[PDB]
Amino acid sequence: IPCGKFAMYPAWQPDADFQRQAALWGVALREPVTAEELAAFIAYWQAEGKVFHHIQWQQKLARSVQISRSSNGGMPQRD
């Protein structure tokens, strides 16, 4: 994991306690982030080129998944 602000990169992962960190930011996640959802978020942001701290990326990921799942009652879609 890079220090400072960095651009998204394919091998990136949230911290192992991501569910609890998302909850302390106001995001309840009924299941953990799926591999599909992570790959979708990384793909998008690596191309957008914006840079952020590891912390801010994780906050973006929590909310992106919260918003994505909201049409499905907080559930991810099956593979």
Residue 19 interacts with a second copy (CB under 8 A): yes or no: no
Residue 54 interacts with a second copy (CB under 8 A): yes or no: no
Long-range contacts of 33-36 (CB under 8 A, 24+ apart): 33/61, 33/65, 33/76, 34/76, 34/79, 36/76, 36/77, 36/79
Residue 24 interacts with a second copy (CB under 8 A): yes or no: no
Residue 68 interacts with a second copy (CB under 8 A): yes or no: yes
Q: Which amino acid is at 74?
A: G
Give residues in contact with a second copy (CB under 8 A): 10-11, 26, 36-37, 39-48, 60, 63-68, 70-72, 77
